[PDB]
A paper describes a structure:
Two tertiary degrons, Asn and Gln, are hydrolyzed into the secondary degron Asp and Glu by N-terminal asparagine amidohydrolase 1 (NTAN1) and N-terminal glutamine amidohydrolase 1 (NTAQ1), respectively. In multicellular eukaryotes, Nt-Asn and Nt-Gln are deamidated by NTAN1-encoded NtN-amidase and NTAQ1-encoded NtQ-amidase, respectively. In this study, the crystal structure of NTAN1, the last veiled structure among three amidases in the N-degron pathway, was elucidated.
Although yNta1, NTAQ1, and NTAN1 do appear to share catalytic functions commonly involving a conserved Cys residue critical for the deamidation activity, they exhibit low sequence similarity to each other. And we explain unexpected substrate specificities of NTAN1 based on structural and biochemical analyses.
Residue numbers in the entry:
A (entry chain C): 1 to 4
B (entry chain A): 2 to 114, 117 to 305
The structure:
Amino acid sequence: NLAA
Amino acid sequence: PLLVEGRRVRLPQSAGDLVRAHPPLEERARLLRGQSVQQVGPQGLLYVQQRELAVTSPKDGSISILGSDDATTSHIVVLRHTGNGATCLTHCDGTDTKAEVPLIMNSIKSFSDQCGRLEVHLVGGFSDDRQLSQKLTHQLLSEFDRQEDDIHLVTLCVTELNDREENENHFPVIYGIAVNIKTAEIYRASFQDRGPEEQLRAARTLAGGPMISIYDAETEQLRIGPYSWTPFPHVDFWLHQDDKQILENLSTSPLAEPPHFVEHIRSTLMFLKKHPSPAHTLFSGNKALLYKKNEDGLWEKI
């Protein structure tokens, strides 16, 4: 998952 | 409001207790977890990325399957009006749930063709060290229950309900799900082909873009763009760190990612370095990158  | 077995859900409440208290929710969770992962092909597929939305109807001739993958702290939400079949799959990551659930409701409430009910499905996440999946389930159940329309919770396999452990390290059981639009059936799935413009659409979310709708059901087109973002801070610094320091700061779950996730980060960070501002460089005439489904069910550029 990508952390914005 | 949000309904379960015809009765309203009392909130706040954990999904584990909500599933234990209602047999049909536990029934769906036992079945979904026991499914062997399916390898969904590219035919008729519409892959949804993190922080993306896709809505369509069984009257579509192009798209027959929606799906998303790599959900570690995210929740892949599926909303569907039974009867007519309007289906919406989004990959909620929790950046702004208060404004994303109205996007989901509006994507379905436009299809009016009365008959059926609204069924919502919630899958993904695990028990992480940062309580991210727990906070995302809290927000999603509250935003749906604040709605006016009656929404019936059918699937709820999230967080504690979707968790496994190896070597005293926790990570999710279900990483991705596909939902077949003609038959309204959801199953575990993996996706080898993830549509066109993977690096362009992933860099948009890593740069801080909001949730968008990527499919227009009227013309059956894939519309990617135009996107504009601030140049990502310290691209060269993160492009030179090791794999360990990349997952700790650019990922919400350092130890729960699928393999080669660093390759996905390095490839995406590489894209942001070449394109600091893609406003008038990747979108000529400020028109979106249009795609349509091929005779063989593939995404071909128009």
